[PDB]
Design a binder for this molecule. Structure first.
Ligand code: IHP
Length: 175
């Protein structure tokens, strides 16, 4: 346990070497990203270590290019009593600020990021407006899925169905 800090330092150095590999090799990008995700999953859930590792990885990976890792990090921050940083990460991922545009509905792009932001807002005691946004988002998702049902998109349709089931469960719990 006393050596864990040095272990994190070694992890960061290895990530740096893998970053130079990511820069050099254009066909290794997906493999490198999967390795980073799995190795980060292996590590402890301390916010500071995750922040250091993500800063290291940011040299070649913008947050938009990998929304899953930053969503996990934001969830960890939210569960660690740092809702300010979690909201900052969510608004960075979305690209627009729902806080300033209260009247404007939440964006539909990146539905996973939207759902994460909505649950963070629910944790932010803004329950009624969060529920209103959730109703609007469910209506948008169902109508968009109905319009965009096609044989080409099935895995996307399955993920959309999973997210919609989660949204329905959250709607029931919050009601
Ligand atoms: O913290 P909660 O509100 O209960 O949400 C949990 C939590 O989601 P976050 O990634 O946003 O934290 C779980 O993540 P863990 O921190 O436990 O790893 C996730 O589980 P997975 O990591 O397996 O995706 C699970 O998702 P699901 O219910 O689809 O299994 C999801 O639950 P809700 O989406 O229903 O809130």
């Amino acid at each position: 346990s006393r050596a864990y800090g040095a272990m994190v330092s070694c992890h960061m150095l290895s990530e740096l070497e893998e970053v130079i590999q990511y820069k050099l090799v254009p066909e290794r990008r997906e493999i490198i990203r999967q390795i980073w995700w799995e190795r980060l999953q292996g590590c402890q859930r301390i916010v500071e270590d995750w922040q250091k590792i993500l800063m290291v990885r940011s040299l070649v990976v913008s947050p938009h290019e990998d929304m899953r890792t930053w969503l996990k990090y934001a969830s960890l921050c939210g569960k660690s009593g740092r809702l300010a940083l979690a909201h900052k990460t969510l608004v960075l991922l979305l690209g627009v600020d729902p806080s300033r545009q209260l009247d404007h509905p939440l964006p539909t792009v990146h539905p996973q990021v939207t759902y994460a932001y909505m649950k963070n807002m629910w944790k932010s005691a803004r329950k009624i407006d969060a529920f209103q946004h959730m109703q609007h988002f469910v209506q948008t998702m169902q109508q968009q899925a109905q319009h965009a049902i096609a044989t080409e998109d099935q895995q996307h349709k399955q993920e959309l169905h999973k997210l919609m089931a989660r949204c329905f469960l959250k709607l029931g719990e919050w009601q």
